[PDB]
Amino acid sequence: SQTNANDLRNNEVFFISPSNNTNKVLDKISQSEVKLWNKLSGANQKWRLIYDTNKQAYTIKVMDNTSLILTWDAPLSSVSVKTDTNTNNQYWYLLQDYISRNVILRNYMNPNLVLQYNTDDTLIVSTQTNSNNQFFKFSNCIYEALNNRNCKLQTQLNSDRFLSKNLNSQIIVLWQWFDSSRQKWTIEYNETKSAYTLKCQENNRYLTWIQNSNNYVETYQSTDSLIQYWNINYLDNDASKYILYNLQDTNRVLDVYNSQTANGTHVIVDSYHGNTNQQWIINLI
Amino acid sequence: SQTNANDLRNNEVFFISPSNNTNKVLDKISQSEVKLWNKLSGANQKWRLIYDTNKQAYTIKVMDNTSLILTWDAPLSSVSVKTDTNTNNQYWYLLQDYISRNVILRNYMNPNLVLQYNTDDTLIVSTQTNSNNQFFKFSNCIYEALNNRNCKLQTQLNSDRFLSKNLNSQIIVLWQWFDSSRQKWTIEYNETKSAYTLKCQENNRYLTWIQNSNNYVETYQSTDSLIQYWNINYLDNDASKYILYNLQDTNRVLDVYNSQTANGTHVIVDSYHGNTNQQWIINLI
Amino acid sequence: ERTFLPNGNYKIKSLFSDSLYLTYSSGSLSFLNTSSLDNQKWKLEYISSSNGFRFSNVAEPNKYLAYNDYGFIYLSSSSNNSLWNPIKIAINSYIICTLSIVNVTDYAWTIYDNNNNITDQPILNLPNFDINNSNQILKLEKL
């Protein structure tokens, strides 16, 4: 409601909460079991949505590096997490009420059945009722954590190498921490682009792909051009690390050139592979 | 999908079509009966959504000035249009898939059941399946008809009195049709405001509420202020006539002063009542 | 409408397979491959005290086929929600109806299929409107 950052987009990651309690979330408590739990923002409480265009339904994948997905244990009424077997009981329609933003999770194998939370905080599937115990809310994890925050960004390559505007240049490079305004980035979600900008504190200009043979990122003036907008996402299966996809070409990502770590190493936009040099650790300043 | 204009907003009016055929729509075919029918954009094919915040479900009211609502004829499988009696079988959850924009209409009295269209164009309620015969698309009628179109606006008070910029003034008044650029208005939906502007062809300036004791409308240059934006909707029960609500105060509408019809009569923004001096007939040029 | 079902032991199949029979296995009720075992055999008993029939698994007396709050059919030592009206619609074909209350919607045993595949599907308690619905028609074979 108002912000579109919580919309049920493909490949986004969410907290899934009961409609009756914003302080609980769907939580993977073991290698097989899910339960409602107090919200801790842990990786085992984060769920990636992956849409299947043929089914018009989604797989729902836990983000604690286990790759397990929410599964209806047909013919029982229980639910689990388990390995992705591409079976119908592992797909869910996510069907949403426009005004309340409440969502049912309706199982693809038997769409009479939806996910339900009980008073004891267990999860089950059930035929459908008017009870709010079948409505859930979805909150985008990254928007919650990062929006309008001043942040520092480490390369996964080295704990003391940070995304840094170069001194006296627009070019963006890796540099050791010196507490510089050149190394501090305001992350802000743009509603029209459904993606983020990152504003250098030093000069109020933005992390931008400059498109030529070098493919450097530089600080650039405000623009509507997609080159300045970034899908900030988690690694495939792991919510502790980030990939920044450029909206101009989402097959390309923020990338430390040839995995070099020396001060002044160029940061660039290049084809995604998800290797260490494309992984970023973002923290509040 | 891309435009937000077809979102399931409270008090907006829609064509409801089967997901498999955009040229068929839900059609009130008689005093009591509903069927899918070839799309003709008649008022008996247009449906207002009215949300109930306690139920998180909607009544769905036909717009041919009969006030009847989509009704599940419990305990049978059939549906009809009937008088609004506040019973639960007349409320429908509208739950939408984000990417496809497809919607199920799930009955509030019995949420085991959803609306289904058959191959013979009949409508029933049914238990839930994986078939597209349970998915519907909603298209906002006014957006479809009027967006980016050059139009004239006739007061319901008189078949030959139109919304007209005065010669040599910015003030907008009623005048007999002269096929003048001063009487031709380009209606354009603004995604950010979710509302329309109306641009006078004579001077490329916009229908705007000028707040002072006169409360006239005038042509004014573009502004981001709500005073220039209008929710264009149909009259309560009748899609043959329009009301234009000003976004700066949506309790106030485009209004012919004291229901006068002389050439030069002022058009103003005033408290909604829905009488004929607030009703407008909008046609393409 | 029709009944004509004597007390006795039956197997229960759907319209989707000749080889899959209603069986009580790992605490779950579903349709599984044909066996000679007592867990895919059902005891039908008409009860006059309150009309309709009760189904019990022969490998498990003391508990009846009932529906729960989730709309699943399951084996219960009950409360009861265990009484059923099998409506005969062919030689050995039945809609198994809930008996409950008048003027409201009829409910019946419903076995969902994905293009005739019922593997791992439970039986659910869902609205019934006709005698034509393949997912609500069961064949009761006398033993």
Side-chain angles (χ1 to χ4, degrees):
Chain A
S1 25
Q2 220 42 250
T3 185
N4 67 28
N6 304 128
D7 290 2
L8 276 352
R9 301 190 173 83
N10 177 242
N11 196 35
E12 289 299 307
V13 175
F14 304 83
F15 301 114
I16 304 175
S17 51
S19 61
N20 82 159
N21 197 341
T22 320
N23 293 325
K24 301 181 164 160
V25 294
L26 183 62
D27 184 305
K28 166 176 175 280
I29 71 163
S30 74
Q31 84 197 312
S32 73
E33 175 161 5
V34 291
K35 205 182 279 298
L36 266 23
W37 203 262
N38 46 285
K39 185 170 184 176
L40 295 163
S41 305
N44 63 302
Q45 306 188 145
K46 298 186 178 175
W47 300 89
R48 188 182 292 284
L49 277 22
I50 305 140
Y51 191 66
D52 177 324
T53 300
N54 301 126
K55 293 185 186 54
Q56 300 180 345
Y58 297 74
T59 64
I60 308 179
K61 178 177 92 198
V62 71
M63 282 301 297
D64 72 341
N65 220 354
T66 197
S67 290
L68 300 184
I69 74 182
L70 188 61
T71 301
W72 164 45
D73 296 329
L76 311 172
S77 59
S78 49
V79 301
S80 65
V81 284
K82 53 196 261 176
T83 180
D84 191 338
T85 61
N86 182 50
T87 54
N88 292 162
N89 57 145
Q90 302 194 298
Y91 289 86
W92 306 84
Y93 302 94
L94 300 188
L95 303 179
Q96 190 172 35
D97 177 56
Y98 172 75
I99 296 157
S100 73
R101 324 296 310 145
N102 288 152
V103 177
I104 68 174
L105 295 74
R106 184 175 75 159
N107 202 268
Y108 185 81
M109 188 169 149
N110 196 141
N112 298 296
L113 297 184
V114 294
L115 190 70
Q116 174 180 309
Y117 60 90
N118 298 321
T119 300
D120 66 358
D121 283 345
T122 54
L123 294 121
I124 211 81
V125 302
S126 165
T127 59
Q128 294 170 43
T129 66
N130 300 119
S131 174
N132 71 16
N133 68 199
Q134 296 185 346
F135 268 151
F136 294 87
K137 280 179 164 83
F138 276 72
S139 298
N140 182 287
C141 298
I142 287 166
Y143 181 81
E144 189 177 298
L146 301 187
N147 198 45
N148 292 324
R149 297 304 210 120
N150 200 16
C151 296
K152 63 197 169 181
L153 286 84
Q154 293 163 111
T155 171
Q156 181 59 89
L157 297 167
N158 191 294
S159 70
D160 193 27
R161 300 299 182 267
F162 292 79
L163 191 73
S164 308
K165 179 191 169 280
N166 232 158
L167 194 235
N168 294 140
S169 163
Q170 304 302 294
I171 300 181
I172 294 159
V173 295
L174 253 23
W175 213 273
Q176 299 170 128
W177 191 253
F178 285 92
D179 199 20
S180 177
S181 60
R182 293 187 288 280
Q183 304 186 293
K184 303 175 185 185
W185 301 90
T186 307
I187 299 191
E188 314 173 72
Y189 184 76
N190 182 293
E191 298 291 325
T192 98
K193 294 299 202 293
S194 302
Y196 293 91
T197 63
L198 291 86
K199 192 189 74 176
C200 187
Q201 189 178 307
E202 192 201 40
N203 62 356
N204 295 136
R205 290 157 54 88
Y206 305 87
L207 180 69
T208 306
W209 181 11
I210 309 299
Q211 300 197 92
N212 59 39
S213 61
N214 289 149
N215 289 126
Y216 297 155
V217 279
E218 298 184 19
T219 53
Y220 194 74
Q221 333 71 262
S222 201
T223 182
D224 289 327
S225 197
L226 293 181
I227 52 170
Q228 187 160 97
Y229 297 87
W230 303 84
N231 172 222
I232 303 183
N233 217 326
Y234 301 120
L235 250 189
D236 196 351
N237 304 315
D238 182 4
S240 52
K241 297 156 195 317
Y242 299 85
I243 306 293
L244 281 77
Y245 305 89
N246 196 93
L247 252 65
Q248 181 78 314
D249 186 337
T250 55
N251 292 141
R252 309 199 183 251
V253 310
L254 193 68
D255 168 315
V256 171
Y257 181 58
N258 286 326
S259 314
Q260 301 312 106
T261 61
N263 286 160
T265 295
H266 284 286
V267 182
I268 72 168
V269 170
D270 202 16
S271 311
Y272 172 85
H273 47 242
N275 295 343
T276 314
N277 70 128
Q278 295 178 346
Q279 296 168 206
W280 299 87
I281 288 91
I282 309 181
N283 281 287
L284 302 182
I285 231 78
Chain B
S1 216
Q2 218 47 198
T3 189
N4 70 26
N6 305 124
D7 295 357
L8 300 183
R9 298 184 169 86
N10 183 52
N11 285 322
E12 289 301 312
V13 175
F14 299 84
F15 298 118
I16 304 169
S17 57
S19 61
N20 80 161
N21 193 337
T22 188
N23 301 310
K24 285 189 185 166
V25 295
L26 187 59
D27 184 309
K28 178 176 170 277
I29 61 160
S30 82
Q31 299 180 18
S32 61
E33 297 164 292
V34 84
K35 214 172 181 192
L36 296 182
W37 204 264
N38 225 290
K39 184 169 177 180
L40 303 161
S41 307
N44 66 128
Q45 298 187 332
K46 301 181 172 180
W47 304 86
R48 192 181 299 270
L49 277 25
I50 303 94
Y51 190 67
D52 180 304
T53 61
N54 300 305
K55 296 179 182 62
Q56 305 185 151
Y58 292 85
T59 56
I60 305 178
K61 177 178 85 187
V62 71
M63 288 294 291
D64 64 346
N65 202 210
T66 61
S67 289
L68 303 182
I69 75 178
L70 190 64
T71 300
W72 166 45
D73 300 320
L76 310 175
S77 69
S78 53
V79 287
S80 60
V81 290
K82 299 205 172 323
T83 305
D84 181 355
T85 71
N86 201 32
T87 55
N88 284 164
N89 60 311
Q90 297 187 307
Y91 292 81
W92 300 86
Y93 300 91
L94 305 178
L95 310 167
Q96 194 167 217
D97 179 53
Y98 175 67
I99 296 162
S100 74
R101 306 262 90 207
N102 289 150
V103 181
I104 66 175
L105 291 84
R106 177 178 79 159
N107 194 82
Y108 186 77
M109 181 176 272
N110 191 333
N112 302 176
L113 299 170
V114 297
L115 196 59
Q116 175 181 119
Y117 62 94
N118 302 128
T119 54
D120 62 0
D121 288 352
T122 66
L123 293 152
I124 63 171
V125 292
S126 175
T127 68
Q128 297 174 217
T129 77
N130 300 116
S131 176
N132 71 182
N133 77 6
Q134 297 184 355
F135 269 144
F136 293 82
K137 284 184 192 297
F138 283 65
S139 294
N140 180 291
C141 308
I142 294 174
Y143 182 84
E144 182 181 310
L146 302 185
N147 198 222
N148 294 317
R149 304 309 305 252
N150 207 190
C151 301
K152 60 193 173 188
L153 294 84
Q154 178 221 306
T155 173
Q156 179 54 27
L157 295 162
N158 192 296
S159 63
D160 200 21
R161 286 307 96 106
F162 289 84
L163 192 69
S164 311
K165 179 190 168 295
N166 259 154
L167 287 154
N168 203 34
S169 174
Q170 304 296 297
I171 293 161
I172 296 157
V173 298
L174 292 187
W175 217 284
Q176 184 188 147
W177 185 254
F178 279 98
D179 198 25
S180 179
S181 57
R182 293 177 293 108
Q183 306 182 116
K184 300 173 187 183
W185 302 89
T186 310
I187 301 186
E188 302 173 284
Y189 188 73
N190 183 282
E191 297 285 327
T192 306
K193 262 44 180 176
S194 305
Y196 293 94
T197 58
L198 292 81
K199 182 193 89 165
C200 184
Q201 181 184 295
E202 191 213 32
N203 66 354
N204 296 148
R205 284 149 66 82
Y206 302 90
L207 178 68
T208 310
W209 180 14
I210 303 301
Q211 299 189 314
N212 57 210
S213 66
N214 293 148
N215 285 302
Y216 294 157
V217 286
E218 302 186 11
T219 53
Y220 194 74
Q221 59 267 210
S222 67
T223 182
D224 290 343
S225 177
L226 297 175
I227 59 164
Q228 191 158 94
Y229 292 86
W230 301 84
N231 290 322
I232 299 179
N233 214 326
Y234 294 124
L235 190 55
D236 192 5
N237 306 134
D238 186 356
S240 73
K241 294 147 179 65
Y242 295 86
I243 304 291
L244 283 80
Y245 301 91
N246 194 279
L247 257 68
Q248 172 61 215
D249 186 343
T250 59
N251 295 137
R252 292 183 190 267
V253 304
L254 199 65
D255 170 314
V256 174
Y257 188 48
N258 290 344
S259 318
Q260 296 313 294
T261 59
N263 283 151
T265 297
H266 278 102
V267 182
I268 67 166
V269 174
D270 201 10
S271 307
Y272 171 85
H273 48 241
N275 297 158
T276 56
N277 72 130
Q278 290 178 352
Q279 303 169 20
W280 297 89
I281 297 199
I282 306 179
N283 283 115
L284 313 176
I285 268 15
Chain C
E1 213 93 352
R2 254 192 292 153
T3 305
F4 297 94
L5 265 182
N7 293 176
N9 282 3
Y10 296 84
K11 300 180 105 190
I12 295 156
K13 62 163 181 177
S14 80
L15 263 30
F16 305 98
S17 186
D18 288 326
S19 337
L20 304 170
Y21 284 87
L22 188 64
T23 144
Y24 183 73
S25 223
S26 306
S28 74
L29 213 56
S30 72
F31 293 88
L32 302 170
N33 222 261
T34 172
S35 91
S36 61
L37 281 62
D38 269 35
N39 64 11
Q40 68 173 233
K41 296 184 166 162
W42 297 90
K43 170 159 188 286
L44 266 274
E45 183 182 290
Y46 180 80
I47 98 102
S48 313
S49 313
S50 188
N51 265 96
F53 292 70
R54 287 202 166 92
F55 296 66
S56 48
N57 193 262
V58 312
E60 205 110 3
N62 292 297
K63 53 187 58 177
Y64 311 97
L65 284 180
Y67 70 86
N68 60 204
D69 290 349
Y70 306 154
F72 279 68
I73 288 72
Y74 77 116
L75 267 197
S76 181
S77 46
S78 55
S79 208
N80 53 291
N81 297 149
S82 322
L83 286 172
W84 307 101
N85 171 212
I87 300 179
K88 193 177 181 159
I89 64 151
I91 164 161
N92 71 321
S93 298
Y94 300 79
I95 312 286
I96 313 295
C97 281
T98 290
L99 47 115
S100 192
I101 202 93
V102 329
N103 185 43
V104 83
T105 319
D106 297 327
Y107 269 67
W109 291 10
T110 312
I111 178 66
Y112 195 88
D113 77 291
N114 281 105
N115 203 215
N116 300 134
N117 191 321
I118 61 164
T119 308
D120 287 333
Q121 293 281 5
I123 298 182
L124 306 180
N125 191 218
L126 288 168
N128 172 260
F129 304 104
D130 51 277
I131 60 150
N132 185 228
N133 188 158
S134 286
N135 301 276
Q136 300 181 316
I137 298 166
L138 286 86
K139 279 179 172 180
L140 273 52
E141 308 184 327
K142 214 183 197 307
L143 301 169

